[PDB]
Amino acid sequence: TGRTIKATLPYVKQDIPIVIVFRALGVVPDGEILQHICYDENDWQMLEMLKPCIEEGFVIQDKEVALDFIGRRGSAALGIRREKRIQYAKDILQKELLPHITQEEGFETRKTFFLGYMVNRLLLCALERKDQDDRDHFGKKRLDLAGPLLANLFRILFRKLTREIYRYMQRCIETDRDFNLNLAVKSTTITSGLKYSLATGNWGE
Amino acid sequence: MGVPALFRWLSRKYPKIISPVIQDEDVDIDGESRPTRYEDPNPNGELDNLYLDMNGIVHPCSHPEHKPVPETEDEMMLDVFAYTENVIMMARPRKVIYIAVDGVAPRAKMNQQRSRRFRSADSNAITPGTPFMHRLADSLRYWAAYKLTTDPGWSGIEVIISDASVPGQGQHKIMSYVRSLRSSPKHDPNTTHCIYGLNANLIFLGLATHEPHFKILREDVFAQDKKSYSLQDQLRMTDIERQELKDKKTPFLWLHLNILREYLQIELNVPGLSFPFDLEKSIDDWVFICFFCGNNFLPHLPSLDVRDNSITTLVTIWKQILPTMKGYLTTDGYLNLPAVERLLAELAKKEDYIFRKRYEDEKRSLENQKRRKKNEEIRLWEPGYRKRYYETKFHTKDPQKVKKIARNMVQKYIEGVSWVLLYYYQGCPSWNWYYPYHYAPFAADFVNLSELKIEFVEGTPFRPYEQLMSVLPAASSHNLPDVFRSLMSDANSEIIDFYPEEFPLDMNGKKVIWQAIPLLPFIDENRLLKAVQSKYDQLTEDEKFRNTNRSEILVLGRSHSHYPTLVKELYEEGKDSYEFQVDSSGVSGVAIKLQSFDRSGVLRLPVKQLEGYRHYPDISNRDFLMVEFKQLPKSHAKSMILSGLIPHLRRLTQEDKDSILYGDFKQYIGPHGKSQYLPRQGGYKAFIQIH
Amino acid sequence: SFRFCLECNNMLYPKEDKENQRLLYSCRNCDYTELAEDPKVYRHELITNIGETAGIVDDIGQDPTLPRSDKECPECHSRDCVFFQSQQRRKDTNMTLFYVCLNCKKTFRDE
Amino acid sequence: TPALTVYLDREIALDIEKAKVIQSSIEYTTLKNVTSATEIYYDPDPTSTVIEEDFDTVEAYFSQSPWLLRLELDRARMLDKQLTMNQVADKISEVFSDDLFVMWSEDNADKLIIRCRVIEEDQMLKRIEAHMLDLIALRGIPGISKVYMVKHKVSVPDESGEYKNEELWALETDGINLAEVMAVPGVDSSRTYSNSFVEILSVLGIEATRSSLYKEILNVIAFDGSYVNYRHMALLVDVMTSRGYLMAITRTGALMRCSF
Amino acid sequence: TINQYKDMIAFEKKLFRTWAQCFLLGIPKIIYGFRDDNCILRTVEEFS
Amino acid sequence: EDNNRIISRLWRSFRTVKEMAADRGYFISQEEMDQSLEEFRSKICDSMGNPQRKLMSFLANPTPEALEKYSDLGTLWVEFCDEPSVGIKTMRNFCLRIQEKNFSTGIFIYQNNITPSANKMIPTVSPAIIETFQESDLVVNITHHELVPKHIRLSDGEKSQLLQRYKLKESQLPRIQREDPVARYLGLKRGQVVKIIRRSETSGRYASYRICL
Amino acid sequence: PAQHTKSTRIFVNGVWTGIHRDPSMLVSTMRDLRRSGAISPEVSIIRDIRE
Ligand SMILES: [Zn+2]
Ligand SMILES: [Zn+2]
């Protein structure tokens, strides 16, 4: 029956309709949503393509109820209730939801525009106006060399060293003695991790 | 009086509580169509406790669609026996079969059933104190003994009989027994229960018990395609169509109250509360609201209507007003006066809007029937309706008298609602209190609730013959004793005014005489008791025995584990009384050795056996045992879940939860999982399960 | 097609008023309702052809990958134009070409 | 690739006109295969209409819910099925009796128009339109998407007892419905063959299933020109059909019990 | 509360001590209440 | 029109039923076998052309040769239900008739479907055997198909001789299901064995045997 | 979007950053800057004119 469009986001248990997340980002009216998706009012076919999505996404009206709706399915525990479930949903929308476009407030318009662009591209592909993307296209592929791999491994090892030195400082403050910071850190962590990963080829701890 | 619309309301609001009850056909194993042995596993989930309401079984006028018509009481007894084996076969309990019979209930329930019997009036032979119940008790006793002695699977079954002599309302005895079990610290909190009843009110009764592992068996009302054609032409069909009342296995339904508990947890969690939201207390308040909307005790409120979704109206009202409260409306059997005062005040503000809406709804309905096919004139839509109503009902023109009567209405109504709440949560608090008026007041009258005082008088259960003559009308004097007949129908009696042949009928703006107002004078206890005690001395010994209340009976099998211990104590050490507490069967109470019971005697069927009805052979008393039973002493029982309560598996999956907020399957019955808590957030189990 | 709400900026849906026996457009995000001037409610045709030229741009002339023909342009009579097949990727799309002139900046067919 | 091979009668196989008639009569055709345009209009007046093009038509017909469902067909595809629009309207009426009032234009109309009314109703009208488009079947055996004519060369003895080649006509149909095809008059029900041996067993029997499966395996083996002795394939098909039903070629002791 | 691998390690180090304490006196069951950095009760778990 | 097609299909079903009865060892007159479509229409269809399903009901008796070969071949009755959707009074009358005049096997033919009540009621006509057939399934005689070799039901003595010759148990023979269309056509029973003569490209003729499940 | 029916969207490293009116001079200048060495030679500049 209805040809609905849904979004799969991290840290949720099931898909969410596009109108729901659009309301969650902070655009309530349908006209603004259509203006974000569509770019030509004469394209009535694409306009009615998403009409089922418009009509099914009606029980959600404003931003707060959308945030409650998305936080309801956001896995985690139960009993959080609205007063902080809305905060958790806002955090899920801010970080881990398109982190590359932005990670700070005041740039949600960019996120809405990119989401509209993605939905428009999907609709153009579905309306047979553009060929589906070829996943064999070598121009849309990358080769990780020693640089990025060593960078990721060093990031992991350095956060491990940071946690270890934080624990050592917390333990040493209780004794209240002047630490030299030279015997505090264990240089064997980074060296051992890098040596093991390079020797065995199993990338990771 | 009870409404299946409440069942309709639950179906149209919470449809996931319904299951169609797998009919226990004979099991075909390796080509053998074995009749379902009672020891065979139940394909409908095992049940621990099964409480029977005999008012739903032995009561022919409740099911007059077919033609039982037993000319002899033998046919009645045998048919009731067969129905009992059918229901216990399809339910298959394992621990306790509480056979509960109606007795003498408190005074307000006496008024309710007095109205019921007056409008109802052998169909009328089902009433405690009559010889019909006298034979019924003995017949049930013999049937229980026969089943315990004969069925190999009934070794661990103990049958507790509360005959018509024992006072108490039918389901009230189950409630008292449940509270008595709760009062024992050794009670098992996971003991699943089930009550075979027809009244929808039992739903809330389950919520009264605060035992989530509770279910109700009912007849499938939605699926009767009733026919009354010739008795021989049903031979045409064998599978699709049969005689739906005599030759077809009647379908049933199961109402699981744990799913309803999960629901009421969902939609009653209102946002922005000054105090933490408790699902227990909120459920108690919801049951309170359901009782306020209408019950067999209190009269009909002139603003709340069940089929007009007044339950939903009050749920919404609670939703708006709870954020402004500092506490719940009621707590563990007692009322919080300010909270209920504020809620009634909010409904008073909404009263004018509700009355106007009812006026337009009535006019639109009348317009609809126009195209589809004591002088009234109150004009509730017009202003001044309260004054005209009070002038019509009371014929008193004094505004001060009306105001004082309204204040007394408020105080008596608060006392009665508290009485009903304590009656359903803490056992009977008063056997003598009754509501002293025929009508319910307006919510606008509920002001200054903290000033009013609450009091009760416990008293004693009424005499069976006194109660019979207080409940039997002049048209059914056959069951009433001939000695008191002169006190009931003779015009020279000092209490003849209590039983007028013709009484005023108050329609109260209703639509069907089923829910009309039977305006009748209230019974004066003093002169009535004096008159009945004047002629009480002329009764015979059998009549006096039938006018004497007694204690509970427990019947136990010879092969049962608790039988040798009871023998070794009572019949060897000579101890007159013994204390149970918890046992292997879950029963608890005081055991008295029965002297009337003969150890070497033989128990014979009190029913003339009829051929083709599985002739009952006589069985000696050597093969079972019977004791006098009492419960633990009455105590103040809290309304909260017990420790170690294991929840079931959640039936809802993110669909009903969203829909309610925004406008076989037998695995959801038992205690799924072993932990009484559930993992969440950052626990060890939660973190292991999530990743 | 369809209209938007004048103050709600919301989606309008058709409905009937029987006191007047008429068709109107209404928004239940609001209470506004306006006179519908067309009894048409829905269109669906199984045979579709639109999407032939698709997104042609005035900058298509400087595309180096497109082949350049020598066809005589109709109105400006130029002898320099590019050509390309239909942009619709439907399975039964015709192979007839569209010719865009580099002088007058317009497209024409091969008829 | 479900497929049916249909052999025509002796006199039909030598003629192309009767064979084309049979092919037209067997090809499945539903409402969607002929309908072109579907519309929903607001038509409050029962006697008259809002649409100008249907004015005289209602005057030709008459002489409720106001929502009207309008159906327009394609003339070429309409005539290509050798049907009449009148019997199409009759079928549309009889599938839903008189609860859905239906009227049809004249056969000579420039536009083939069918108007339906029922006696909020947008959603039910849409679902009824979908049901009409997806269920209303006009002509043909269900499950037959396409039929192809094929010329077959068969060796037949002459009056002198000499074998000679002869060219006849037959049909190859996408989709499998063996019983209905065999029941069609003008079709040689004693020689109809299918490449789906499961429904061959469900229709013909176990022995015919063995024969058909041997034919299929022989075709697969001999497509490239390789030769395999008949006895091996006969043994394989006998193993596969020995139990009275098809058996797919696909996947106790205490010492082994303790060894596990 | 638990949010990382070191959290399981510390929790099972505490679990060993509490299990030893219950095993000494023969306590058949153990119950934990989980608190965050704000001393707010988060979860309650039971073990044998 | 459609009425002519319906009458033709009904006549084809009647011819297939007669062929099955003849193949089951019963005696059918040559005139009954050679009843043309026009004669069937004249003797069955009325002025408006509707058929009379009660008229095609008939009684058949085994031939003396078949009775000698198969001693268990009793009387056979064939009835066609008038109603498209069968009313259960039809086979109620069927059952009481079979009981009252003691027919061995009765074959009931329905048009669209039979309610499961009658389906599980018809086995209670012991010792008589009742078999059901859909009228649609009887349009085409599948026994005349090229891919279907001839099946001949073996007598008890022939079956015993076969088992002795091959030194077999009853379970070691190739099996055929009771719901197999050929088995339904022949009216097989459990334990009975059919001989199949089959064209073979290595020996010309081949003989096989299949025992009903 | 109503007035910008002819504007060309600009993507940097896979994220939409803005729109431009005349892209021919923009791409010419960017290509000239990359060729002159002002921009890193490995920076990919692509102008897909179809959309
Ligand atoms: Zn609006
Ligand atoms: Zn030009």
Q: At what angle do helices B73-91 and B131-150 cross, to 10 degrees?
A: 40
Q: Do C21 and D44 touch (CB under 8 A)?
A: yes
Q: Do C90 and A128 touch (CB under 8 A)?
A: yes
CA R_g for chain D: 27
Closest partner residue to E42 among B676, B681, B685, by Cβ?
Answer: B681
CATH number reported for the structural domain that contains residue A107 in this entry: 3.90.1110.10
> Which run of H or E residues covers position E25?
helix E5-25
Contact of F187 with F131, CB cutoff 8 Å: yes
C-alpha D214/C-alpha D237 separation (Å) is: 6
Contact of F207 with F197, CB cutoff 8 Å: yes
Specify the long-range contacts of residues F5-11, CB closer than 8 Å, at least 24 apart. Answer: F5/D185, F6/F51, F7/F37, F7/F40, F7/F41, F7/F44, F7/F45, F7/F49, F7/F51, F8/D185, F8/F37, F9/D183, F9/F139, F10/F44, F10/F51, F10/F135, F11/F35, F11/F37, F11/F40, F11/F41
Name residue D43's amino acid. D
Q: Domains of chain F, with CATH numbers?
A: 1-140 (3.40.1340.10), 141-213 (3.90.940.20)
| Cβ atoms < 10 Å from Cβ of B28 | 9
Distance C71 CA to ligand 2 centre (A): 10
C-alpha C93/C-alpha C107 separation (Å) is: 19
Q: How was this model experimentally determined? A: cryo-EM
Report the sign of the C-alpha dihedral through residues F117, F122, F123, F126, in that order.
positive
Q: Do C57 and G23 touch (CB under 8 A)?
A: no
Dig out the tokens for B654 from the structure: 């993110």
Q: How far is B192 from chain E (nearest CA, A)?
A: 23
C-alpha D6/C-alpha B60 separation (Å) is: 69
C-alpha F162/C-alpha B585 separation (Å) is: 67
C-alpha B491/C-alpha B502 separation (Å) is: 14
> DSSP string covering B624-665, please?
EEEEEEE-PPP----SSPPTTPPP------SSHHHHHH----
Q: Provide the b/e sequence for B266-302 (b: ≥16 CB within 10 Å).
A: bbbeeeeeeeebeebbbbbbbbbbbbbbbbbbbbbbb
> DSSP string covering chain F, please?
-HHHHHHHHHHHHHHHHHHHHHHTTB---HHHHT--HHHHHHHH--TT----TTTT-EEE-B-HHHHHH-TT---EEEEE-SSSB--HHHHHHHHHHHHHHT-SEEEEEESSB--HHHHHHTT-STTSEEEEEETGGGSS-GGGSTT--EEEEPPHHHHHHHHHHHT--GGGS-EE-TTSHHHHHHT--TT-EEEEEEEETTTEEEEEEEEE-
Dig out the tokens for D87 from the structure: 């019997």
| Residue that has been written with the tokens 């499950």 in this structure | D143
SS3 B677: coil
| Residue that has been written with the tokens 């004591």 in this structure | B374
E32 contacts in chain B (CB < 8 Å): 684
Please count the residues of chain A.
205
Dig out the tokens for D254 from the structure: 């205490």
CA R_g for chain F: 19
Chains A and C touch (3+ CB pairs under 8 A): yes
Report the sign of the C-alpha dihedral through residues D174, D176, D182, D184, in that order.
negative
Closest partner residue to B687 among E2, E32, E36, by Cβ?
Answer: E2
Name residue B138's amino acid. D
> Which run of H or E residues covers position B262?
helix B257-267
SS3 B593: strand
Name residue A50's amino acid. L
Beta-carbon contacts of B55 under 8 Å, excluding residues fewer than 6 positions away, are: B62, B102, B126, B170, B197, B198
Q: Do E46 and B677 touch (CB under 8 A)?
A: yes
CA R_g for chain A: 24
Domain boundaries, position A27? 1-142
Q: Closest Cα to residue C102, out of C78, C85, C86?
A: C78
What is the four-CA torsion angle of B577, B581, B584, B590, rounded to 10 degrees? 30
C-alpha A16/C-alpha A18 separation (Å) is: 6
| Residue that has been written with the tokens 């042949």 in this structure | B501
C-alpha F76/C-alpha F59 separation (Å) is: 6
C-alpha B333/C-alpha B634 separation (Å) is: 15
Q: Closest Cα to residue F58, out of F27, F87, F95, F96?
A: F27
Contact of D119 with D64, CB cutoff 8 Å: yes
Contact of B517 with B508, CB cutoff 8 Å: yes
Q: How far is B688 from chain A (nearest CA, A)?
A: 13
**Phi, psi values for residue B51, rounded to 5°:** -105, 125
C-alpha B525/C-alpha B436 separation (Å) is: 12
Q: Half-sphere exposure of residue G38, counting CA atoms within 13 Å on the CB side?
A: 7
| Residue that has been written with the tokens 């033709």 in this structure | F8
Q: Do F144 and D190 touch (CB under 8 A)?
A: yes
C-alpha A107/C-alpha A94 separation (Å) is: 10
- Ligand 1 ion: residues within 5 Å (CB): C 5, 8, 10, 27, 29-30
Q: Please list the residues that pair with D37 across neighbouring strands.
A: C45, D72
Q: C-alpha angle with apex F109: D206 to F150, nearest 5 degrees? A: 30
CA R_g for chain B: 27
Distance C96 CA to ligand 2 centre (A): 19
**Phi, psi values for residue F182, rounded to 5°:** -65, -40
B681 contacts in chain E (CB < 8 Å): 1, 34, 42-43
D44 contacts in chain C (CB < 8 Å): 21-22
Chains F and G touch (3+ CB pairs under 8 A): no
**For the domain bounded by C1-44, which CATH number is listed?**
2.20.25.10
Q: Closest Cα to residue F198, out of F188, F212, F208?
A: F208
Mutation for testing the E interface, residue in B687, B688, B689, B691 having most E CBs under 10 Å: B687
**Phi, psi values for residue C67, rounded to 5°:** -70, 150
Report the sign of the C-alpha dihedral through residues B342, B344, B346, B349, in that order.
negative
Dig out the tokens for B611 from the structure: 């051929």
Distance B352 CA to ligand 1 centre (A): 30
Q: Closest Cα to residue B25, out of B253, B221, B251?
A: B251
Name residue C27's amino acid. C
B236 contacts in chain F (CB < 8 Å): 88-89, 92
Subunits that touch chain A (at least 3 Cβ pairs < 8 angstroms)?
Answer: B, C, G
Q: Please list the residues that pair with B255 across neighbouring strands.
A: B18, B216
Number of H helices, E strands in chain G: 1, 2
**Phi, psi values for residue B435, rounded to 5°:** -70, 120
Burial of B420: CB neighbours in 10 Å, binned 0-12, 13-18, 19+ = buried
Dig out the tokens for G49 from the structure: 């004119």
Mutation for testing the B interface, residue in A12, A75, A81 having most B CBs under 10 Å: A81
**Phi, psi values for residue B369, rounded to 5°:** -70, -20
**Phi, psi values for residue B280, rounded to 5°:** -60, -55
User: Strand B552-557 and strand B47-53: pairing?
Assistant: unpaired
C-alpha D95/C-alpha D133 separation (Å) is: 13
**CB-based contact, G29 to chain C, within 8 Å:** no
E44 contacts in chain B (CB < 8 Å): 677
Write the CA distances from A55 to B201, B217, F196, integer angstroms. Answer: 40, 41, 66
| Residue that has been written with the tokens 């592909």 in this structure | A125
C5 contacts in chain A (CB < 8 Å): 31
Q: How far is A180 from chain B (nearest CA, A)?
A: 36
Burial of F56: CB neighbours in 10 Å, binned 0-12, 13-18, 19+ = buried
Dig out the tokens for B412 from the structure: 């008596």
C-alpha D131/C-alpha D35 separation (Å) is: 13
C-alpha F66/C-alpha F26 separation (Å) is: 7
C-alpha B296/C-alpha A59 separation (Å) is: 39
Q: C-alpha angle with apex B399: B395 to B405, nearest 5 degrees? A: 70
SS3 C44: strand
A30 contacts in chain C (CB < 8 Å): 4, 9-11
> DSSP string covering chain D, please?
--EEEEEB-HHHHT-HHHHHHHHHHHS-EESTTTEEEEEEEE---SSS-S-GGGHHHHHHHT---SEEEEEEE-HHHHHHTT--HHHHHHHHHHHSTTTEEEEE--TT-SS-EEEEEE---HHHHHHHHHHHHHH-EEES-TT---EEEEEEEEEEE-TTS-EEEEEEEEEEEES--HHHHHHSTTB-TTT-EES-HHHHHHHT-HHHHHHHHHHHHHHHHHTTT----HHHHHHHHHHHTTTSS---S----HHHHHH-
Please count the residues of chain C.
111
C-alpha C67/C-alpha C81 separation (Å) is: 9
C-alpha B658/C-alpha D146 separation (Å) is: 47
Beta-carbon contacts of A159 under 8 Å, excluding residues fewer than 6 positions away, are: none
Contact of B602 with B621, CB cutoff 8 Å: yes
C-alpha A155/C-alpha A163 separation (Å) is: 12
| Residue that has been written with the tokens 């297939």 in this structure | F16
G9 contacts in chain C (CB < 8 Å): none
Please count the residues of chain D.
260
Q: C-alpha angle with apex B417: B416 to B419, nearest 5 degrees? A: 60
Q: Give strand ranges (E) for B44-181.
A: 47-53, 93-100, 158-162
Q: Closest Cα to residue B495, out of B539, B450, B451, B528?
A: B528
Distance C97 CA to ligand 2 centre (A): 16
Contact of F197 with F149, CB cutoff 8 Å: yes
Contact of D122 with D129, CB cutoff 8 Å: no
Q: What's the DSSP call for residue G6?
A: S
C-alpha A44/C-alpha A118 separation (Å) is: 19
**Phi, psi values for residue B136, rounded to 5°:** -60, -40
Residue contacts between B and E (CB atoms, under 8 Å)? 39
Q: Half-sphere exposure of residue C23, counting CA atoms within 13 Å on the CB side?
A: 21
Contact of F201 with D230, CB cutoff 8 Å: yes
C-alpha D124/C-alpha F40 separation (Å) is: 48
Contact of F95 with F129, CB cutoff 8 Å: no
Q: Do B239 and F92 touch (CB under 8 A)?
A: no
End-to-end alpha carbon distance in chain A: 49
Contact of A50 with A37, CB cutoff 8 Å: yes
C-alpha B220/C-alpha A185 separation (Å) is: 75
| Residue that has been written with the tokens 């005589």 in this structure | C72
Beta-carbon contacts of A125 under 8 Å, excluding residues fewer than 6 positions away, are: A131, A132, A133
CATH 2.20.25.10 residue ranges for chain C: 1-44, 45-111
C-alpha A152/C-alpha B369 separation (Å) is: 78
Write the CA distances from B256 to B259, B522, B666, integer angstroms. Answer: 6, 40, 11
Beta-carbon contacts of F132 under 8 Å, excluding residues fewer than 6 positions away, are: F107, F108, F109, F110, F114, F119, F122
> DSSP string covering B50-89, please?
EEEEGGGTS-GGGS-SS----SSHHHHHHHHHHHHHHHHH
Closest partner residue to F148 among D183, D193, D207, by Cβ?
Answer: D207
Q: Do A114 and G1 touch (CB under 8 A)?
A: no
Q: Closest Cα to residue D96, out of D129, D54, D73?
A: D129
**CB-based contact, A39 to chain G, within 8 Å:** yes
Closest partner residue to F146 among D183, D191, D203, by Cβ?
Answer: D191
C-alpha A45/C-alpha A55 separation (Å) is: 16
Binding positions of C for Zn(2+) are: 5-8, 27, 30, 73, 76, 101, 103-104
Q: Using CB atoms and an 8 Å cut-off, which of residues 219-248 of chain B contact chain F?
A: 235-241
Contact of C100 with C61, CB cutoff 8 Å: yes
CATH class of C45-111: mainly beta
C-alpha B117/C-alpha B472 separation (Å) is: 7
Q: Please list the residues that pair with G19 across neighbouring strands.
A: G9
Subunits that touch chain F (at least 3 Cβ pairs < 8 angstroms)?
Answer: B, D
Beta-carbon contacts of F91 under 8 Å, excluding residues fewer than 6 positions away, are: F81, F108, F118, F121, F122, F130
G23 contacts in chain C (CB < 8 Å): 59
Q: Closest Cα to residue D72, out of D105, D96, D50?
A: D105
Name residue B171's amino acid. Q
| Cβ atoms < 10 Å from Cβ of F127 | 7
Q: Do C51 and A129 touch (CB under 8 A)?
A: yes
Q: Closest Cα to residue A24, out of A34, A13, A33?
A: A33
Q: Do C88 and A128 touch (CB under 8 A)?
A: yes
**CB-based contact, D38 to chain C, within 8 Å:** yes
CATH class of D18-139: alpha beta
Name residue A170's amino acid. Q
Closest partner residue to F147 among D183, D185, D208, by Cβ?
Answer: D208
Contact of A29 with C10, CB cutoff 8 Å: yes
**Phi, psi values for residue B638, rounded to 5°:** -70, 165
> Which run of H or E residues covers position B591?
strand B590-593
Burial of C100: CB neighbours in 10 Å, binned 0-12, 13-18, 19+ = buried
Beta-carbon contacts of B261 under 8 Å, excluding residues fewer than 6 positions away, are: B207, B212, B279, B283
Q: How far is G16 from chain A (nearest CA, A)?
A: 7
